[PDB]
Amino acid sequence: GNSPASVLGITANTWKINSFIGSPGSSATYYDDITDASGISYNTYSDDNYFYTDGEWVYFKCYRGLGGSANSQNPRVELREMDNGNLASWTGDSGTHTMEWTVQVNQLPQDTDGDGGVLCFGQIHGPSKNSDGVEVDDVVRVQFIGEENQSSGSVKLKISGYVTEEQGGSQTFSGYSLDTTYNCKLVYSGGYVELFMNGSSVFRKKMEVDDLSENYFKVGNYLQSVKGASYTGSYGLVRIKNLSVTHN
Ligand code: NA
């Protein structure tokens, strides 16, 4: 009655859950679909180290160096958009495609280099190679960036992924904060990627790529700048409610 999947209103047919098993540490084991793990079923899954609820929010807790033994890339505990059991895959200039979620970031991790902390709390992901060979990978990452292990206060919104990095550089925006509710709306329509925060358009930019097929949303906690980092207990914490995806 109280599970994270029930509180957030998600099902295996609408979102796949990327999570870990084992105590947090460099030897924890990543699962692209956590329900593949022994003993785990989607509508009862909860683990206070990673993915849990208090009946209002669902918390995604991920750690610097988590699983670093197996893979040095940035770790995540996150949802992957599904389409009635098929993988979601949709086109950024045909139809209008929206993810809305209410979020806070409560804690930033510590970069590999020790200076700074950052994580991504929503994304659009595209094809690794589109039909023209363009390496799209993440279309956009919506992130907060601040101090290493930051626990309160002021951060910047940072927009990364293809739409900024391959088109003039990542973009940052002042005046955001930890422990602060934002109603986020991420739209891909007409070949433009756009974020609204509390009803204001804060970022909007065209993808100058021909083939905008094979996108899907992700949302959760994808740490950043922790490639090759050791496990120290440093973590990020993202909490979400009021999640929906709309396709028109
Ligand atoms: Na299982």
CA 193 to centroid of ligand 1, rounded, Å: 36
CA 38 to centroid of ligand 1, rounded, Å: 5
Measured in degrees and rounded to the nearest 5, phi and psi for residue 6 equal -70, -45
Instruction: Answer whether 220's CB lies under 8 Å from 102's CB.
Output: no
CA distances from 50 to 19, 32, 129, 152, 182 (A): 7, 14, 31, 20, 22
CA 168 to centroid of ligand 1, rounded, Å: 44
DSSP 6: H
DSSP 205: E
Instruction: Answer whether 203's CB lies under 8 Å from 195's CB.
Output: yes
CA 247 to centroid of ligand 1, rounded, Å: 30
122: nearest Cα among 108, 136, 101: 101
CA 197 to centroid of ligand 1, rounded, Å: 37
- Tokens 């909860």, located at residue: 46
Instruction: Answer whether 158's CB lies under 8 Å from 174's CB.
Output: no
CA 19 to centroid of ligand 1, rounded, Å: 13
Domains of the chain: 1-248 (2.60.120.200)
Method for this entry: X-ray
CA 32 to centroid of ligand 1, rounded, Å: 13
CA 222 to centroid of ligand 1, rounded, Å: 23
d(CA 64, CA 218): 20
CA 43 to centroid of ligand 1, rounded, Å: 11
CA 104 to centroid of ligand 1, rounded, Å: 30
d(CA 183, CA 243): 10
CA 147 to centroid of ligand 1, rounded, Å: 38
184: nearest Cα among 84, 123, 100: 100
CA 40 to centroid of ligand 1, rounded, Å: 4
Per DSSP bridges, beta strands 200-206 and 216-223 are unpaired
CB-count burial class (<10 Å; 0-12, 13-18, 19+) for 228? exposed
